[PDB]
Amino acid sequence: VLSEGEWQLVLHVWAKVEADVAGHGQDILIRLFKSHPETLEKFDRFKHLKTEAEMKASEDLKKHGVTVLTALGAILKKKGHHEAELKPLAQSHATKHKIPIKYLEFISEAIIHVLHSRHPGDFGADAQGAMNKALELFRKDIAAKYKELGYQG
């Protein structure tokens, strides 16, 4: 479990994202899709996008980035007490969207990478450490529900 000091770090950083949630979401999704193209294929909604310019121009992609980071923000603000928030996400990602846990690792690395872009004067080492712990806890708990459902090794 994260310490309170580590949660403080997580949420300080998170408040940063909230200054421009759509901008952060955009950059995170694009970094995910470009770094790991197998992920884009999982989105019927986005798979027509063939270049980073097209991705940056997509208003719908930006709208979806806000849905994603709104859900993740809410989970982080529960400081590990996120059973009710995670249940429907693990269910739809395992059984409907068919997203492997590996891809949740990729989007976690994209989140970290986009922070090294947007908060390069904060996002200190301590904060990077805590954010990776928070995202690992998120993946651990989703993986446990994947396994229950026959989707996690």
Q: Residue 1 CB, nearest distance to Zn ion (Å)?
A: 26
Short-list 113, 90, 96, CA closest to 32: 113
Q: Residue 14 CB, nearest distance to Zn ion (Å)?
A: 21
Task: Tell me the H-state helices in 36-124.
Answer: 37-41, 52-57, 59-76, 83-91, 101-118
Question: Pick from ligand HEM, Zn ion, none: which does 45 bind, CB < 5 to 8 A by kind?
Answer: ligand HEM
Q: Which two tokens stand for residue 88?
A: 């429907």
Question: Pick from Zn ion, ligand HEM, none: which does 3 bind, CB < 5 to 8 A by kind?
Answer: none
Would you say 36 is a known binding-site residue?
no
Binding status of residue 106 toward Zn ion by CB under 5 A: yes
Q: Residue 99 CB, nearest distance to Zn ion (Å)?
A: 14
Question: What totals of helices (H) and strands (E) does the chain contain, helices first?
Answer: 8, 0
Q: Which two tokens stand for residue 63?
A: 């709208």
Asked whether 138 and 75 are in contact (CB, 8 A), the reply is yes
- The residues of the shown chain that bind ligand HEM, judged by CB under 6 A, are 39, 42-45, 67-68, 71-72, 88-89, 92-93, 97, 99, 103-104, 107
